[PDB]
Amino acid sequence: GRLFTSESVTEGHPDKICDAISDSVLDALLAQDPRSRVAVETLVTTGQVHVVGEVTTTAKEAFADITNTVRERILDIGYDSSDKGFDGASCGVNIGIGAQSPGDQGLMFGYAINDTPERMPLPIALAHRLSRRLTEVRKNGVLPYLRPDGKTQVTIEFEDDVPVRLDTVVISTQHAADIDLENTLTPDIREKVLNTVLNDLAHDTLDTSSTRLLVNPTGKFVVGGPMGDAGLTGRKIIVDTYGGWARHGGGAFSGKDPSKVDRSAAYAMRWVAKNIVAAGLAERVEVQVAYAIGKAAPVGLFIETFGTATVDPVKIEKIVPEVFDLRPGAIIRDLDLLRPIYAQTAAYGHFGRTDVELPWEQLNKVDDLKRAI
Template identity: 65%
Template sequence: MCRTGRSTPSPRRSSTRCRGGSPPEADDGPSSSKSRHPPPYPGPVRRGLNRLVYDSSGTQQTNPGAAQSSARLGRLSVAHDLRLFSSESVTEGHPDKICDSISDAILDAMLEVDPDSRVAVETVVTTGLVHVVGEVSTRGYVEIPRIVRRRLMEIGFDSSEKGFDGTTCGVSVSIGEQSPEIADGVTESLESRSSGGAIEADDRAGAGDQGLMFGYAVRETPELMPLPIALAHRLARRLTEVRKDGTLDYLRPDGKTQVTVGYDENDIPVALDTVVISTQHNPGVTHEQLETDLRREVIDPVLAAEGLPDLDVTSLKLLINPSGSFVVGGPMGDAGLTGRKIIVDTYGGMARHGGGAFSGKDPSKVDRSAAYAMRWVAKNVVAAGLAERVEVQVAYAIGRANPVGLYVETFGTGTVDRKVIEDAIRKVFDLRPAAIIRELDLKRPIYGPTSAYGHFGRTDVDLPWERVNRTADLRAAAGL
């Protein structure tokens, strides 16, 4: 294990992380005599932890399998001498995530019958009612109320005792047709209209809207995601797993997780400070039972699976249902709306966000497809060894095929000049909307699984924008 600060100043990260382990699948870069440049991303070590032991306040007392605290921590208080960064996740039974899930289920159904469907679907849920609105153009037909009810049942809202029943709730649908003016701008781009028709195929399709999209990758986890959001998603997924497989059958679908990680002066994660879990449950479940069961079945397995070889956990605080009883949840507890968890969906607040939500939108909407492309770009840049951490931005004008802007920030961690990375991206990646859709094969019904537990860094599903398949091209373009 190696942590080496870099001399280049950085607004957030100015460090090089050296960790062993298996790399993500990637094509090998061309050989180079410039040995000062690191090889493609090697990946961090993955080691298991022994079971954690806590006192009644939720503070860990012993952890025989954990690595010793970093020498730089010494006797200093984690809370007072490290910068603490937090990210949250929610389960698929959270009201806003119910809406994302329904919107993406409708999108997938429409792409199944017509891959060229134009879809912009929003969902609202409240006590006893689901309302679906939006604009759609498709050559096929789908039974939206049936899709809604099936998805609610799959999530686990299958009984009035849980506050919401997918078989008996009201479902209303208000779907119109996509604006013909927007449709025309997507079908015939500004470049196409200006050229008189003699134009490359990928220049013919314009962006479905103006906007800016960000992509991000950092060498903190094997999937090149920020550690706080990666852990928060794993805890949320595990909550759902133990509920659905009957391990903790008294749990209900709604739930939230939050993870606070301590970063040192070089912006390296060195300590796990706080884990918060709030989960809906049946009446009569005691807080003591919930704490014991969640520690054993959710928290311990997630932390053990992650390994956390570089993190100090001696001051870890666990807060489980800190508000007390959580029986009333889901749409009965709060109304939900598509697109209200955009930070959960992306990088947990570690990177900037252009503001556009993803769920319910077909890939002609650059809010979604270009954000996916930017993650693909960023992940390959880091995997290629061009930077330890990178954020990339792209911007579009409605009806125009070519992006109006591309911005690259490496926060002082680049191994080559920032302009070299930008030029390499322009050379290797075609960021016109039609090219993105083709390269990532986005006209398929693949969006349902992304509606909960994050769109990026997923280890449980194969998503095309997570593939590390352009590293050799990037290194060659950068002269490495």
């Protein structure tokens, strides 16, 4: 029986702090100037944030306010005290962003699979559901002693490609110093985080009766975030996408405006793949787009259905570029990408989100595909 493990992290993980700050700067600029060009990278370490990169924008007032946007995001994450390892109101904030006033050979992958309602691979889907729920129970006061930093890991056993057993769940979370790990943290996390997520999913074949749950296996986790650590933007690209289950062409998402094809074309390929499986044309699919210098539209569109197609895969390949307009400008227009919608994507995955509606997750092309067959 094959095992597969994926992980997720909360918004309080230092690498995710950086992704969120980078995309908070992006959203701030897009809110005032939708055509801003942005390439913003964030570093955090003990007591400090360093935001660098380049921007072309007319949004000078938003640019001036970046320092405050940074602090506010850190406070929203929940870092508001040195006791927690980090305080957005009093940490160091340094800005080294160059500012001015105003194709390529490419491959990009997308993936979808009918193993979850959100059409994601089960290990990453479950890991993200758990990291989101972990944060939710902190913020809604159900478990008020929790602190922001955390990580989830999910190992599933498969038999002939069917997920049959939930093998291991690891949940590591930051928490107040007075909390008993064995008699308070562990059962609260089992009841309020693991069991609620498993009930939400109600998976048809995943046996969770003998799951090994480990909560804070390395013990006390009182201080977290950048304290005694460091984070950078774009260091969780597998967490951001498919958890290792699918191939990745390279390129991080956060801090990049939608003109960056690494972001927008990856989003488009997810959209294509999700609509293909939701249309029942395959149970799982990897979609690959090929772009060439000097041509807007793709020079190639390839799929792999792993034996699960219900129609000829060559037919699927033919109809995708008829149904979808995969020119970069069309993707931007059609998904309405020149809007401040990115800070929300910077933790808990860019794909398969059950808590927010994202343009590239909409099943608005299922009918189109069915008509084209």
